[PDB]
Design a protein around this ligand. Structure first.
Ligand SMILES: [Cl-]
Ligand SMILES: [Cl-]
Ligand SMILES: [Cl-]
Ligand SMILES: [Cl-]
Ligand SMILES: [Mg+2]
Ligand SMILES: [Mg+2]
Ligand code: NA
Ligand code: NA
Ligand code: NA
Ligand code: NA
Length: 326
DNA sequence: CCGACGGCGCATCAGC
DNA sequence: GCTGATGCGCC
DNA sequence: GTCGG
């Protein structure tokens, strides 16, 4: 982190744009700039130097000059002092409260953790769980703990059906020493792009993980995606482990490589790769890569037998997961 | 200058 | 009840 | 806010 000061500033700007201004393209622009600066291997000496990086433009270069000179950004100093902006930014830290809900809550006068706790009746199911575990959800998960969680999930899934394959993705698969949450990609030969030969494939797995008290709460659940809370078991006399977020995604078995590409991320990596695909005349989702016809309609799914095949289509050199942390 | 900016699952609500 | 919009979430 | 054409 040679340029941590700058990347922190840009991230705070991004969050303000997303949460307060509700400007999603500005949010993405700031994050893209922060990401490109974060991997730049020199300590940045000026705005002009930064402006040579793709995604850093005139306005960001100016902000960088201000920050290098003074160590702060007047724009941010003002935003921090603003009560409405401060409140909104805080409320969006609760899982389930977005920019819209946060602004609506602040209008009602609900703008602190204390206010939230006394107005549970005003929260939906997801938000009530987000509040319950507010503290826990902001803690990172050490890789050592991720390994214990992997063992529980993989062993429990095997007990449901030995044909399931579960893969931990996200930052874990990128080799991070700590993770924000646990991301699990699940496949079963009965669920392909052509047919669903068994019902409740995801349900059976969630149920089993609940039965062993690993999964503790549910935020949302459908046929292909579960979003919930889990917790490692603690030993006798041991303090409990924090509750953790868990996401499970059931992907058609024949579409594993596209699925694991998506779920490995990072998010900014996915955005960059998908944008590059479009420039190259292709569209990528978690299921397929398809050509874009002259008109605009996506064509038929192209053959994929490896993650690398996807990179080959868009003429990118292959990047191992560890090199996708953007 | 101006259009595009990644793609999608689940929850909630309005209209019919 | 369904369909489409919108919010919020995931990478 | 930035980029491409
Ligand atoms: Cl915007
Ligand atoms: Cl600052
Ligand atoms: Cl695939
Ligand atoms: Cl598809
Ligand atoms: Mg994750
Ligand atoms: Mg994430
Ligand atoms: Na630039
Ligand atoms: Na939130
Ligand atoms: Na996740
Ligand atoms: Na573009």
């Amino acid at each position: 982190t040679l340029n941590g000061g700058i990347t922190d500033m840009l991230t705070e700007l991004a969050n303000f744009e997303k949460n307060v201004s509700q400007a999603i393209h500005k949010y993405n622009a700031y994050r893209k700039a922060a990401s490109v600066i974060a991997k730049y291997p020199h300590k940045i000496k000026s705005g002009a130097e930064a402006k040579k990086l793709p995604g850093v433009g005139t306005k960001i270069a100016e902000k960088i000059d201000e920050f290098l000179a003074t160590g702060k950004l007047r724009k941010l100093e003002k935003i921090r002092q603003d009560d409405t902006s401060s409140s909104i930014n805080f409320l969006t830290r609760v899982s389930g409260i977005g920019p819209s809900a946060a602004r609506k809550f602040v209008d009602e006068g609900i703008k602190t953790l204390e206010d939230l706790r006394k107005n549970e009746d005003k929260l939906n199911h997801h938000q009530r769980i987000g509040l319950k575990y507010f503290g826990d959800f902001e803690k990172r998960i050490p890789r050592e703990e991720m390994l214990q969680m992997q063992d529980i999930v993989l062993n429990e899934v095997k007990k449901v059906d030995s044909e399931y394959i579960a893969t931990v993705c996200g930052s874990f698969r990128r080799g991070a020493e700590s993770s924000g949450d646990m991301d699990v990609l699940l496949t079963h030969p009965s669920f392909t792009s052509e047919s669903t030969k068994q019902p409740k494939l995801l349900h059976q797995v969630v149920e089993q993980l609940q039965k062993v008290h690993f999964i503790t709460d549910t935020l949302s659940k459908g046929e292909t995606k579960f979003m919930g809370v889990c917790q490692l078991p603690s030993k006798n006399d041991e303090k409990e482990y924090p509750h953790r977020r868990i996401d499970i995604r059931l992907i058609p078995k024949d579409q594993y490589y596209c699925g694991v590409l998506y779920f490995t991320g990072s998010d900014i990596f996915n955005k960059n790769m998908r944008a590059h695909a479009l420039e190259k005349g292709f569209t990528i989702n978690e299921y397929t890569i398809r050509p874009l016809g002259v008109t605009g309609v996506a064509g038929e799914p192209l053959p994929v037998d490896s993650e690398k095949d996807i990179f080959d289509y868009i003429q990118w050199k292959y990047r191992e997961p560890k090199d996708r942390s953007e």
